[PDB]
Amino acid sequence: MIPVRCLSCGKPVSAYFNEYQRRVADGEDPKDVLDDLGLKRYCCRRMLISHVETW
Numbered sequence: 177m178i179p180v181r182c183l184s185c186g187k188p189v190s191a192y193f194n195e196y197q198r199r200v201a202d203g204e205d206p207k208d209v210l211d212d213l214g215l216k217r218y219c220c221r222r223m224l225i226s227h228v229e230t231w
């Protein structure tokens with residue numbers, strides 16, 4: 177997960193980032209993944225679901 181910025185808000189998103197990747201890959205609703213990812217506060221998601229530079 178990117179430092180400084182908000183990509184967790186308390187809970188790690190890296191381990192979950194795999195879910196987003198797998199889902200978004202096949203074509204699954206990422207926002208739904210966000211629910212699974214477990215990223216408190218949308219302040220992170222809003223940046224993730226859009227950017228979330230997984231590369």
Ligand SMILES: [Zn+2]
Pocket residue numbers: 182183184185216217218219220
């Ligand atoms: Zn946050």
